[PDB]
Amino acid sequence: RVLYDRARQYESTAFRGLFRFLRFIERMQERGDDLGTARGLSEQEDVVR
Amino acid sequence: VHRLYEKELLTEEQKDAIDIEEIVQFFHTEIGGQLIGAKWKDREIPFSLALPAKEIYPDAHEADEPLLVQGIIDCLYETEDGLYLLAYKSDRIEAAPILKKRYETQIQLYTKAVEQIAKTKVKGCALYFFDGGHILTL
Amino acid sequence: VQLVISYGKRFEAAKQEKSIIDFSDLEHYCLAILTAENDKGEREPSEAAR
Amino acid sequence: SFAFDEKAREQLSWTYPHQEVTQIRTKQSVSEI
Amino acid sequence: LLNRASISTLHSFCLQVLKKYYYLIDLDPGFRIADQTEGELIGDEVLDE
Amino acid sequence: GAEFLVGRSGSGKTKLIINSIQDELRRAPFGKPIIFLVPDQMTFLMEYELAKTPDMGGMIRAQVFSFSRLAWRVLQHTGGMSRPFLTSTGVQMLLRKLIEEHKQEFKVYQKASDKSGFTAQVERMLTEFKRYCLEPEDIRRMSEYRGERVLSEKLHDLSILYQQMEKSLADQYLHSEDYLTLLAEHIPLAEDIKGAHIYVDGFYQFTPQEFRVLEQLMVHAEHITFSLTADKPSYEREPHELELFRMTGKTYYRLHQKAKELNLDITYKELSGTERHTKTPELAHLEAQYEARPAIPYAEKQEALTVMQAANRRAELEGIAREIHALVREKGYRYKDVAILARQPEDYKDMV
Numbered sequence: 056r057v058l059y060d061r062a063r064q065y066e067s068t069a070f071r072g073l074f075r076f077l078r079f080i081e082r083m084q085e086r087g088d089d090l091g092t093a094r095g096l097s098e099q100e101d102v103v104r
Numbered sequence: 105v106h107r108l109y110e111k112e113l114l115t116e117e118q119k120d121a122i123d124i125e126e127i128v129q130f131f132h133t134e135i136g137g138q139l140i141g142a143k144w145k146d147r148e149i150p151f152s153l154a155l156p157a158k159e160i161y162p163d164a165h166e167a168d169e170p171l172l173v174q175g176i177i178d179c180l181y182e183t184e185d186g187l188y189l190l191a192y193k194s195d196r197i198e199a200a201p202i203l204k205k206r207y208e209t210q211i212q213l214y215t216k217a218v219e220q221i222a223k224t225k226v227k228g229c230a231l232y233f234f235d236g237g238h239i240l241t242l
Numbered sequence: 243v244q245l246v247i248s249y250g251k252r253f254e255a256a257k258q259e260k261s262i263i264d265f266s267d268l269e270h271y272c273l274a275i276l277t278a279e280n281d282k283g284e285r286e287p288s289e290a291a292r
Numbered sequence: 293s294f295a296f297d298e299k300a301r302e303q304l305s306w307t308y309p310h311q312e313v314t315q316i317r318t319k320q321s322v323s324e325i
Numbered sequence: 326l327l328n329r330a331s332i333s334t335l336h337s338f339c340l341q342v343l344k345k346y347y348y349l350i351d352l353d354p355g356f357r358i359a360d361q362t363e364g365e366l367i368g369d370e371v372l373d374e
Numbered sequence: 375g376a377e378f379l380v381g382r383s384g385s386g387k388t389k390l391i392i393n394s395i396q397d398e399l400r401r402a403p404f405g406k407p408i409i410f411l412v413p414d415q416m417t418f419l420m421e422y423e424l425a426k427t428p429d430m431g432g433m434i435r436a437q438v439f440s441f442s443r444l445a446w447r448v449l450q451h452t453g454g455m456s457r458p459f460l461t462s463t464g465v466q467m468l469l470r471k472l473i474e475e476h477k478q479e480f481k482v483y484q485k486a487s488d489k490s491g492f493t494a495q496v497e498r499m500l501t502e503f504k505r506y507c508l509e510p511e512d513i514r515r516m517s518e519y520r521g522e523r524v525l526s527e528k529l530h531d532l533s534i535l536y537q538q539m540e541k542s543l544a545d546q547y548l549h550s551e552d553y554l555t556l557l558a559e560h561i562p563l564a565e566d567i568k569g570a571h572i573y574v575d576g577f578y579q580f581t582p583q584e585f586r587v588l589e590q591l592m593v594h595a596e597h598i599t600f601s602l603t604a605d606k607p608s609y610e611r612e613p614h615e616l617e618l619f620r621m622t623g624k625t626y627y628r629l630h631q632k633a634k635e636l637n638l639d640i641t642y643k644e645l646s647g648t649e650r651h652t653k654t655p656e657l658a659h660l661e662a663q664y665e666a667r668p669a670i671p672y673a674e675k676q677e678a679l680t681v682m683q684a685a686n687r688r689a690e691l692e693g694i695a696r697e698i699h700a701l702v703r704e705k706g707y708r709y710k711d712v713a714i715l716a717r718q719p720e721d722y723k724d725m726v
């Protein structure tokens with residue numbers, strides 16, 4: 056799901072289109088940058104934080 | 105034409121692209137004469153007509169909304185005989201059965217529009233072509 | 243020192259081209275806007291600051 | 293046997309009564325017809 | 326008015342200042358805040374250059 | 375003459391207007407022109423609705439117009455439509471060109487003149503000026519105020535760009551926001567207007583540029599009806615800041631005072647009872663008790679009003695999708711009966 060949404064945000068910014076997007080992701084990982092795993096329960100919900 | 109050029113209803117290049125002879129010839133025609141001599145006249149008539157979808161498309165439904173067909177009628181005039189419709193075409197000619205079918209459905213749309221909305225009958229339709237001053241009736 | 247200073251200048255230029263800014267550029271450009279005259283720490287408020 | 297068998301079956305077999313006209317453009321031109 | 330209130334991070338305020346007074350510095354009014362990776366990628370490019 | 379048709383939302387103003395135009399179409403199929411003036415987003419809607427008579431199934435005497443369409447028609451008969459048209463992008467291009475040769479004359483925007491976003495900002499501003507009838511002279515013309523110095527610097531630079539633009543466009547081109555002004559000064563000379571009946575509805579407010587056109591129609595048209603969504607508005611004074619019908623109220627006040635300024639015969643029609651929420655108690659309660667402080671609680675049952683909480687926009691849209699399915703599968707509605715509105719459509723468009 057967040058793969059979709061992150062595609063949405065990056066398209067809108069400087070990496071529109073498959074080739075540019077993938078290149079961004081690849082260069083991101085290649086210099087040790089990462090992204091967080093998605094979340095299921097929101098912060099508001101009844102959860103141990 | 106010149107007045108239309110000074111009202112900016114017609115650009116200079118538009119003004120110079122006029123065959124005055126071709127348009128004057130129309131008023132020497134029978135339909136043209138009947139136009140000049142009419143009870144009531146009107147030009148550039150806008151219209152919207154509501155045709156039930158089944159007529160244009162198989163499988164539509166009586167509940168299903170009508171489609172809206174829209175156009176502009178060039179001229180309409182009324183004599184003691186009835187109401188007549190007039191349209192102008194710059195079609196290349198210099199051919200009659202071909203032009204007849206080329207604009208047939210359009211004329212039928214116009215007639216049906218007048219008949220349905222104005223609740224009046226339409227006797228005779230006319231199409232004037234600038235090339236050679238031809239006039240065909242439908 | 244001169245290497246780092248060049249990088250910064252070139253870096254700012256690159257971002258200006260693509261019309262983007264750091265988180266850092268937020269504070270520093272804001273500070274730039276808010277100052278009119280800057281004499282070694284003594285900062286005089288510009289019109290925006292006022 | 294399950295309490296929602298008939299309703300599940302009926303809903304998965306359902307089609308919109310006016311499906312055919314959902315893509316039909318309302319406005320039409322004399323040229324278009 | 327609580328919507329338009331200046332209650333935030335200092336960085337958010339900074340963003341407001343830039344948005345209003347872009348013309349006082351060398352900044353495009355339609356500027357955007359880069360995200361960490363795209364900024365740092367641009368940094369990598371200029372550093373290589 | 376003028377007729378002020380006023381009511382709250384659900385009163386029946388629009389339907390009333392439609393019925394009037396339809397009756398008038400039955401009585402005289404080839405009568406004097408009927409002009410239905412609505413916002414652009416409303417034009418096709420009204421065309422459809424007017425075309426839905428078992429009686430006639432279409433129109434001829436009556437036409438639906440936006441300000442833009444109306445301008446295009448009247449100018450296509452009276453003139454001024456011949457000169458070339460400029461897009462917003464074209465104007466931006468011109469503005470950039472002017473910047474490059476007048477940037478050294480600026481007082482404040484000299485540094486900003488470099489950026490492409492600045493030309494867009496200036497375009498937006500100048501467009502607003504033209505919409506509020508402010509020629510470059512009035513900009514030049516422009517209670518002690520702290521920001522007066524900078525403001526006058528800005529307005530100075532803007533006036534340079536504005537005057538230069540008007541100079542470059544003069545005798546050659548037509549700005550996008552000039553149609554309405556050109557329309558205002560050709561309406562007196564237009565024959566079709568002279569006997570016409572005019573209905574204006576859907577608008578919450580008008581730009582001064584649109585007001586010019588409206589009062590010209592007040593003068594040279596036979597009758598004109600102004601349909602406003604408000605509750606018993608005052609001609610005596612503008613509405614309070616916190617008032618619900620602030621916008622449409624102010625529109626009423628200004629329109630009425632200009633009708634009075636021109637000695638027109640005015641007619642007042644106030645729609646009281648609801649017609650939309652006649653069968654739905656909850657929605658009538660919501661419509662009536664919206665502004666009320668303190669609000670009286672609804673004491674009956676819940677059926678037609680639902681507040682929904684979604685885990686996210688994805689959940690929100692899917693939930694709504696399910697509900698819509700329910701409505702067209704059990705409750706007997708059709709898809710056309712449903713509307714989905716967002717304050718910020720960009721948050722949902724793709725996902726929708």
Ligand SMILES: Nc1ncnc2c1ncn2[C@@H]1O[C@H](COP(=O)(O)OP(=O)(O)NP(=O)(O)O)[C@@H](O)[C@H]1O
Nearest residue numbers: 381382383384385386387388389390602603649650
């Ligand atoms: N005479 C009527 N009897 C019953 N229902 C009606 C009548 N006229 C209109 N309606 C219904 O009322 C609803 C809206 O009426 P409408 O004419 O739009 O009022 P309105 O004043 O324009 N509301 P608004 O545009 O929000 O200020 C529609 O769903 C119509 O079906």
Ligand SMILES: [Mg+2]
Nearest residue numbers: 387388575576
């Ligand atoms: Mg309405």
